Amino acid sequence: IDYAMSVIVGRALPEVRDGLKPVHRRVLYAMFDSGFRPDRSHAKSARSVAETMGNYHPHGDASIYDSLVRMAQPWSLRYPLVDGQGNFGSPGNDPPAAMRYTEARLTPLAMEMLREIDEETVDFIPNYDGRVQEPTVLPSRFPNLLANGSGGIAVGMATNIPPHNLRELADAVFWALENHDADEEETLAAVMGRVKGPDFPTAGLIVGSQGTADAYKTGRGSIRMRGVVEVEEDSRGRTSLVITELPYQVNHDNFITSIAEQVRDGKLAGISNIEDQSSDRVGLRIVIEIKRDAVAKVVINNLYKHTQLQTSFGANMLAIVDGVPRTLRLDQLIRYYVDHQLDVIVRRTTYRLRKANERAHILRGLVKALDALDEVIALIRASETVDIARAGLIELLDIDEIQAQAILDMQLRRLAALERQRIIDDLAKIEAEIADLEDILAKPERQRGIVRDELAEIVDRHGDDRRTRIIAA
Amino acid sequence: DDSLDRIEPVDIEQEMQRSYIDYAMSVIVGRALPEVRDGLKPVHRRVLYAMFDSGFRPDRSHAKSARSVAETMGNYHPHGDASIYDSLVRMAQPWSLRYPLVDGQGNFGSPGNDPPAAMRYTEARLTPLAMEMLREIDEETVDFIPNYDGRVQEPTVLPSRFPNLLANGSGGIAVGMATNIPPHNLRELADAVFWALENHDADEEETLAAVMGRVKGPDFPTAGLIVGSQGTADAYKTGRGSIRMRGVVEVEEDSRLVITELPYQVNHDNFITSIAEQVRDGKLAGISNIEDQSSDRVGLRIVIEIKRDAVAKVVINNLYKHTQLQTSFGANMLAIVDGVPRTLRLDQLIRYYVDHQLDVIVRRTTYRLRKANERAHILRGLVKALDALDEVIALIRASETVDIARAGLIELLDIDEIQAQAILDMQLRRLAALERQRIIDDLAKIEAEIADLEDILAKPERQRGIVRDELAEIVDRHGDDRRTRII
Ligand code: NA
Ligand code: NA
């Protein structure tokens, strides 16, 4: 039926607001709700998988651990959300260890995605069995969809958003925050000016400008990615080619294999031997030894030709906007994100203000009780029951049942001189807070300034240098 | 293993390997078979405890099985959900367990080949009997140990307020050795236990006879009939025996052969299949047609019709012969006692259970006694404060800080820091007339409790009487009529 697709496209494509699919959102939220934060010891992955399975994804589905694992791989995510410990696989064919052998916890950036989620910043909905509530989206204090990108298949409509530099994106966002009046085309230009292009975790080089611009303005484009090969004098002492970087998503093992197989086919003469000298110290380092009668330049170009040393990234900016799949331009992605940020901020202050009032209400009744301490005390001791006392206090002080209950819940230790003053002082602080909150609600410029300052803090702390180099040649 | 005369470097490695195996498998066996005390294997114990720790109690709504499977998987059994759900499911089937521990809702399968629904479609919760297995587990009644990752503690055994191992029985294979204990009647077992409680001085031969006298034999949840006495007796006195089970066929006619019960563990579908596949092979001539007419509200009903020629029950006898309408239960009372597998006699099973019950009770009393004292300590200081209420109140209001107040109170009342902190933690509502009296009354109750507790610790007869009364209560509520009929 019509809702069939609406569900297939839910597991297939990412939301534009946080850039996540239901699985990942569930996993992250589960870890959060479990307290698996960065300032705490890693927890066995089985714990996270289990918390997700029982509350949100009731399947012995391998897709849970698969999501947890992937969000931990620095070669897959430009900005990882999971902090892994143990065997989480490799850029090659080496498979990850079982749930029970690995440990995981959230990264500081992931903590920014969940920031203030308990302050009604996003809409929650009941889970599969209706016992608990789950988030439809995360606050996403940092532009995750564009930062980490996304890749998924729908009914022939598969998304393919590339990763980007956090510092750059933040610049584009800051511009959109100040130029709220601007029109799309005026914005499309400013954002395209700040975001130089994709920034893959694997580094490498992007060759050209067409693919990028096409993607940013038409939501579709072919980006030319190229590995990084160095030329070295070997112990031969002749020439050896050294590939230190590969294009995004290129499997190291499959790559080396294609070279050896392509060679045997006779398609890659000039090559004497291939050897992997990679390591955590040296990083990627595939040494290709060329024959003494060979030109480095010709071998290189033949590599670009017959291997993934040079490959294309087929960008397709397709995301879910209000439950409907859509192909977007960079300016739309940016505006939809900013809108969400603003929505989060108003909702946050709306919530804080409500709770601030409830707090002040109680305090006003505690202060009243203080000004009549001797009376309330005698009244309470004279009362045969707490009910009588509750009723007597309401009458005696002119307060409601909640306020009257707060007084009866008060502890002896709060009667100490400095304790009593603390109640007074608090009341003043709370009233001042309420005012400031009401001010934010009244001024859209204040709200805009808040998202800007908070985002700036985030970029200062977690922002990093660009990895992928753009080559106009 | 092997033998000695070699003097080689390859034989040093051979000896060590044999040693590691012995140690290795001597430990694996501790898992394959059930413990004497609670009758459970680690999987089941973990599942039950997880449900308990989650609050999935009989007095609350069923929860999706996936929740139970998940709680188990993450805290105690991180290997997968297959083994877990299978255990949860098995413990909910009234045709498998004489006394189910899990209360299932939805498709938990059938006595035949119909498979259960997925964990997201079924719901489950603990039965009242399961709640008895976990009774007082939070009062240091059993030894706990850290779990796989050391983040949480898990039980090595459950309090087991009812004789589960003998009640529900058990069947497993560890290392060539496989246990096979049959289920029994709770009311009967309780009688045997009550006897052992009163006749603590009795000897093996006497106890054996006394218990064999109260437990008439296995009582399968699938009812049926046991033919003979040798098998049963053999099992109860040698820990091994062959018990003959028989279905219940009550033939009828037109209007123009009805099997209503099958032996324990006999698959309904496989049974009917064996009949048809054999008949068509001519091996079972004299049968016109088979027909399943069972349904909830009627029960098992397999209709078998004979040819005109033979209206003889000789067809019944041919059934007993070539089908599972009559099959044997190979009893083998093998359980884990102190980490070591052992074949036991009914009296040993009974005494080891009683010992555990007694252990649980003194441990419970010991714990309750400690907590009471800590409680009485606090109360004594709250009462003191009450007798000087006006003073303590003025003192507190005069104190510039809670520290000053804490110090002032210690002096003023002659009490320690803990007692002095309890007073400062006291709430206004506790100053109400009836509230104040409640503190006084409590102190008297606590002191009385402590005394009684200390008494239990001193008297073994009191401890024995406690397990007897509590067990009696359980049998009155959850005990049920016998199902299997003997001879
Ligand atoms: Na008021
Ligand atoms: Na005292």
Numbering used by the authors:
A (entry chain B): 29 to 501
B (entry chain A): 9 to 264, 269 to 499
Source paper text:
The crystal structure of the breakage-reunion domain we solved to 2.7 Å resolution, revealed a promising interaction that will be further exploited for drug design. This interaction involves the N-terminal helix, which is anchored in the active site of a symmetry-related molecule. The crystals belong to space group C2, with a dimer in the asymmetric unit. Consequently, the final model spans residues 9 to 499 for chain A and 29 to 501 for chain B. GA57BK forms a biological dimer in a ‘closed’ conformation in the asymmetric unit, as the C-gate, which constitutes the so-called primary dimer interface, and the DNA-gate, the secondary protein-protein interface, are both closed. In contrast to other structures of the breakage-reunion domain alone (i.e. E. coli DNA gyrase, S. aureus and S. pneumoniae topoisomerase IV), the N-terminal segment of GA57BK (residues 9–41) is ordered and is organized in two distinct secondary structures. Residues D9 to E16 form a loop whose B factors indicate high flexibility, followed by a 24-residue long α-helix. The α-helix is deeply anchored in the active site of its neighbouring molecule. In addition, D30 establishes hydrogen bonds with the hydroxyl group of the catalytic tyrosine (Y129) and a salt bridge with the catalytic arginine (R128). The presence of this N-terminal helix would prevent DNA binding.
The breakage-reunion domain contains the catalytic tyrosine responsible for the cleavage and religation of the DNA double helix.
